[PDB]
Design an enzyme around this catalytic site. Structure first.
Site, PDB file in Angstrom:
ATOM      1  N   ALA A   6       0.845  -1.188   0.000  1.00 21.23           N
ATOM      2  CA  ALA A   6       0.000   0.000   0.000  1.00 21.23           C
ATOM      3  C   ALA A   6       0.879   1.235   0.000  1.00 21.23           C
ATOM      4  CB  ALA A   6      -0.922   0.012   1.202  1.00 21.23           C
TER       5      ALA A   6
ATOM      6  N   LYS B 260      -3.560   3.192  -2.578  1.00 19.97           N
ATOM      7  CA  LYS B 260      -2.920   4.014  -1.551  1.00 19.97           C
ATOM      8  C   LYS B 260      -3.809   4.179  -0.317  1.00 19.97           C
ATOM      9  CE  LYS B 260      -0.535   7.013   0.681  1.00 19.97           C
ATOM     10  NZ  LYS B 260       0.875   6.718   1.146  1.00 19.97           N
ATOM     11  N   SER B 261      -3.239   4.031   0.878  1.00 17.89           N
ATOM     12  CA  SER B 261      -3.992   4.284   2.096  1.00 17.89           C
ATOM     13  C   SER B 261      -4.702   5.614   1.990  1.00 17.89           C
ATOM     14  CB  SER B 261      -3.066   4.299   3.295  1.00 17.89           C
ATOM     15  OG  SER B 261      -2.641   2.985   3.576  1.00 17.89           O
TER      16      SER B 261
ATOM     17  N   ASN C 285      10.874   7.024   3.948  1.00 24.03           N
ATOM     18  CA  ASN C 285       9.899   7.985   3.476  1.00 24.03           C
ATOM     19  C   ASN C 285       9.170   8.575   4.634  1.00 24.03           C
ATOM     20  OD1 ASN C 285       6.754   7.288   3.650  1.00 24.03           O
ATOM     21  ND2 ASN C 285       7.943   5.382   3.637  1.00 24.03           N
TER      22      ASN C 285
ATOM     23  N   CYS D 107       0.460   3.719   9.969  1.00 26.45           N
ATOM     24  CA  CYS D 107       1.086   4.850   9.303  1.00 26.45           C
ATOM     25  C   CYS D 107       2.065   5.524  10.259  1.00 26.45           C
ATOM     26  CB  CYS D 107       0.060   5.865   8.828  1.00 26.45           C
ATOM     27  SG  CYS D 107       0.921   7.254   8.094  1.00 26.45           S
TER      28      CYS D 107
ATOM     29  N   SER E  80       6.350   0.014   7.374  1.00 29.73           N
ATOM     30  CA  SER E  80       7.732   0.400   7.507  1.00 29.73           C
ATOM     31  C   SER E  80       8.230   0.207   8.918  1.00 29.73           C
ATOM     32  CB  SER E  80       7.844   1.877   7.183  1.00 29.73           C
ATOM     33  OG  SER E  80       7.367   2.118   5.881  1.00 29.73           O
TER      34      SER E  80
HETATM   35  C1  LIG Z   1       6.676   5.749  -0.543  1.00 30.39           C
HETATM   36  C2  LIG Z   1       5.988   4.778   0.367  1.00 30.39           C
HETATM   37  C3  LIG Z   1       4.626   4.957   0.605  1.00 30.39           C
HETATM   38  C4  LIG Z   1       3.958   4.066   1.437  1.00 30.39           C
HETATM   39  N1  LIG Z   1       2.612   4.241   1.683  1.00 30.39           N
HETATM   40  C5  LIG Z   1       1.948   3.358   2.498  1.00 30.39           C
HETATM   41  C6  LIG Z   1       0.587   3.495   2.722  1.00 30.39           C
HETATM   42  O1  LIG Z   1      -0.032   4.409   2.185  1.00 30.39           O
HETATM   43  N2  LIG Z   1      -0.054   2.587   3.540  1.00 30.39           N
HETATM   44  C7  LIG Z   1       0.652   1.553   4.121  1.00 30.39           C
HETATM   45  O2  LIG Z   1       0.094   0.746   4.855  1.00 30.39           O
HETATM   46  N3  LIG Z   1       1.998   1.417   3.893  1.00 30.39           N
HETATM   47  C8  LIG Z   1       2.643   2.306   3.082  1.00 30.39           C
HETATM   48  N4  LIG Z   1       3.986   2.150   2.869  1.00 30.39           N
HETATM   49  C9  LIG Z   1       4.717   1.022   3.520  1.00 30.39           C
HETATM   50  C10 LIG Z   1       4.731  -0.123   2.548  1.00 30.39           C
HETATM   51  O3  LIG Z   1       3.382  -0.476   2.362  1.00 30.39           O
HETATM   52  C11 LIG Z   1       5.514  -1.257   3.166  1.00 30.39           C
HETATM   53  O4  LIG Z   1       4.860  -1.618   4.361  1.00 30.39           O
HETATM   54  C12 LIG Z   1       6.957  -0.865   3.482  1.00 30.39           C
HETATM   55  O5  LIG Z   1       7.507  -0.052   2.466  1.00 30.39           O
HETATM   56  C13 LIG Z   1       7.786  -2.132   3.656  1.00 30.39           C
HETATM   57  O6  LIG Z   1       7.836  -2.798   2.409  1.00 30.39           O
HETATM   58  P1  LIG Z   1       9.121  -2.702   1.455  1.00 30.39           P
HETATM   59  O7  LIG Z   1      10.298  -3.157   2.274  1.00 30.39           O
HETATM   60  O8  LIG Z   1       8.801  -3.596   0.286  1.00 30.39           O
HETATM   61  O9  LIG Z   1       9.271  -1.258   1.031  1.00 30.39           O
HETATM   62  C14 LIG Z   1       4.654   3.012   2.032  1.00 30.39           C
HETATM   63  C15 LIG Z   1       6.018   2.840   1.802  1.00 30.39           C
HETATM   64  C16 LIG Z   1       6.688   3.718   0.963  1.00 30.39           C
HETATM   65  C17 LIG Z   1       8.156   3.503   0.733  1.00 30.39           C
HETATM   66  O1  LIG Z   2       1.917   7.695   3.593  1.00 33.41           O
HETATM   67  C1  LIG Z   2       2.837   7.410   4.389  1.00 33.41           C
HETATM   68  O2  LIG Z   2       3.593   8.272   4.880  1.00 33.41           O
HETATM   69  C2  LIG Z   2       3.069   6.030   4.835  1.00 33.41           C
HETATM   70  C3  LIG Z   2       2.070   5.326   5.336  1.00 33.41           C
HETATM   71  C4  LIG Z   2       2.326   3.965   5.836  1.00 33.41           C
HETATM   72  O3  LIG Z   2       3.482   3.464   5.800  1.00 33.41           O
HETATM   73  O4  LIG Z   2       1.338   3.383   6.325  1.00 33.41           O
END
Ligand SMILES: Cc1cc2nc3c(=O)[nH]c(=O)nc-3n(C[C@H](O)[C@H](O)[C@H](O)COP(=O)(O)O)c2cc1C
Ligand SMILES: O=C(O)/C=C/C(=O)O
Ligand SMILES: Cc1cc2nc3c(=O)[nH]c(=O)nc-3n(C[C@H](O)[C@H](O)[C@H](O)COP(=O)(O)O)c2cc1C
Ligand SMILES: O=C(O)/C=C/C(=O)O
Ligand code: NI
Lengths: 313, 313
Positions: free
Chosen positions: B21, B45-46, B69, B132, B197
């Site tokens: 997401a 996107k959330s 991020n 988040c 994250s």
């Molecule tokens: C730019 C960016 C935006 C993200 N936006 C969301 C989000 O909107 N909702 C959410 O639950 N996680 C969000 N995440 C976290 C990712 O969903 C994921 O949990 C995190 O990046 C770990 O996965 P990865 O190691 O593959 O990056 C975001 C991560 C990044 C890097």
């Molecule tokens: O939109 C963000 O900042 C990230 C959200 C998330 O990791 O849940």
């Protein structure tokens, strides 16, 4: 022209480097090797009142990006480390930290009561470990703010010296705030070591389709490359929120540059765990020269010049 | 022969892969690209009830070991994602998850009320984001066990469907237990996505002596290589503790082998964040191919054959 000297806790340190508690500091030979090393200081393995064999092996695995361990506080016991501090450590060479990780508040109290005299007489400095993530059925104390306050209250009550606390990483400003608020209530906590391992990661070997350490179903503290931004975050978070206290950085230091980052984040001392585990105490000669090289390239002469000066946007 | 097929929540997924997401799923174009991609699914996107600009830029930084991020939930608002789910998404191509991240329990409740009809009619599946870590002054709900239980109660009350929860990583078995106990109170929580994250790391660029993102003094969520053992830990921890639920793995997937680890840890779906950000939706062709290659080499034909089967010592 340049100097890695650090002056804190009524001590002078040749450089900010020291081992991370638990790494190469369990045995006499390790403590002596750390003392003989180029490190600015050293900290003895986190001790319990009595010797502990620790968790079943394998309990440590070096990894491309760091390490995972579930050592489980194998240590020679408090008497041993107390005796090293009281009778054996050459304080002429460098200051000594003694890491203490009682399995209960009572244990920390009892050891602190006895540590008091040796701290007074010899100048050993307590690093109170509130973040052992590897003893089965024992939560990281500092993840329970009540347990943390209670432990700090107890130690502060019985221990007539300043000391530091080895902290687990936190991952939210709410927790930085809550932990800092508590720490700031204890004037004896004069340093905060950020961080202990990122707790209870799980390394899985794709080849063996198995975990890589035996204790706790393979869950263990992560160190090394994995943890550097978390360490810097915590270093800086507490550097900011605990302005009356020193921060010791620990986590992900392999190079002078990594060390430079710790200091930029606010670290006074820089502890080295995984990298030291893999390289041995010779690492301190490398880290000192590398940090000096970084400072030379950046035209820094002292650590004071950039400690905590990380620029925000 | 072999299948990456996943069956869950009355759906068939061609493979376990989907975006994480927030990654490449904010705009119509991104959602269409995700739908057109080789991914087994996608998540929007959330969303918040109304559009959000999100945090000041720069708010994302790719790193050798992953990403940091502090996006701050920039999103087109719930109506937009709801409309995508209701009117635009080709469910013939793949199932759709809608990520929801209200800034309050009430916001989630109100959105869920309206999502309910679209879930019924079109089969969009809610992923409720309780993790988040980037909205200033808003803690990760899932780090507050009472608040999480409260929110899940409130959502379950108004949302007559299965949904999943996007979880932050935890770092102690006591928290795995506490979190799992809460999630286990909610039969509608049919999946748990581990992990969001690693919250509030701090990347410092040694060359610029500065943080690399603007919001929150440079503190932001870590993704990518940094997070894999933590992700695996959480996936497996919840896999074990919530046997009634499926786990979606998220964190540190760059390769079919990484995905293999997620699945070995217990993942049904495998979400790809940082790697996807850095490679784009073509990554899914690669990942499916690589995971099949891994499975071929390991003589697995289906994911069910090894899901959750990581061997402990
Ligand atoms: C730019 C960016 C935006 C993200 N936006 C969301 C989000 O909107 N909702 C959410 O639950 N996680 C969000 N995440 C976290 C990712 O969903 C994921 O949990 C995190 O990046 C770990 O996965 P990865 O190691 O593959 O990056 C975001 C991560 C990044 C890097
Ligand atoms: O939109 C963000 O900042 C990230 C959200 C998330 O990791 O849940
Ligand atoms: C094998 C091993 C043993 C450790 N023992 C202790 C310990 O006894 N007390 C403690 O506070 N931290 C202990 N740690 C954590 C380190 O002090 C350090 O916080 C962590 O490894 C992060 O630093 P690094 O990235 O340089 O490894 C240990 C770490 C390892 C890998
Ligand atoms: O002895 C250990 O397991 C490590 C303890 C710690 O990281 O504090
Ligand atoms: Ni936590």
């Amino acid at each position: 022209s340049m100097s890695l000297q650090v002056n804190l806790l009524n001590n002078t340190f040749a450089n900010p480097f020291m081992n991370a508690a638990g790494v190469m500091c369990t045995t006499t030979e390790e403590l002596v090797a750390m003392t003989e090393s180029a490190s600015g200081s050293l900290v003895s393995k986190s001790c319990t009142p009595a010797l502990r064999e620790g968790n079943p092996t394998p309990r440590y695995q070096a990894l491309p990006l760091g390490s995972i361990n579930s050592m489980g506080l194998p240590n020679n016991g408090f008497d041993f480390y107390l005796a090293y501090a009281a009778e054996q450590h050459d304080y002429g060479k460098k200051p000594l930290f003694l890491s203490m990780s009682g399995l209960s508040m009572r244990e920390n109290v009892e050891m602190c009561k006895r540590l008091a005299a040796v701290a007074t007489e010899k100048g050993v400095i307590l690093e109170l470990n509130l973040s052992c993530p590897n003893v089965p059925g024992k939560p990281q104390v500092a993840y329970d703010f009540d347990a943390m306050r209670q432990c700090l209250t107890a130690v502060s009550e019985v221990y007539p010296h300043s000391f530091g606390v080895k902290m687990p990483p936190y991952f939210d400003f709410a927790h930085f705030d809550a932990a800092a608020e508590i720490l700031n209530e204890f004037p004896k906590v004069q340093f905060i070591t950020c961080i202990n391992s990122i707790g209870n990661g799980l390394v899985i070997d794709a080849e063996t389709e198995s975990v890589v350490i035996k204790p706790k179903q393979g869950f263990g503290g992560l160190g090394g490359r994995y943890v550097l931004p978390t360490a810097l975050a915590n270093i800086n978070a507490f550097y900011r929120r605990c302005p009356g206290k020193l921060i010791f950085g620990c986590g992900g230091v392999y190079t002078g540059e990594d060390a430079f980052l710790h200091v930029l984040a606010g670290a006074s001392m820089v502890q080295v765990g995984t990298a030291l585990q893999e390289e041995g105490p010779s690492i301190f000669e490398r880290l000192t020269s590398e940090l000096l090289g970084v400072m030379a390239k950046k035209r820094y002469q002292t650590l004071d010049e950039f400690r905590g000066k990380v620029r925000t946007l």
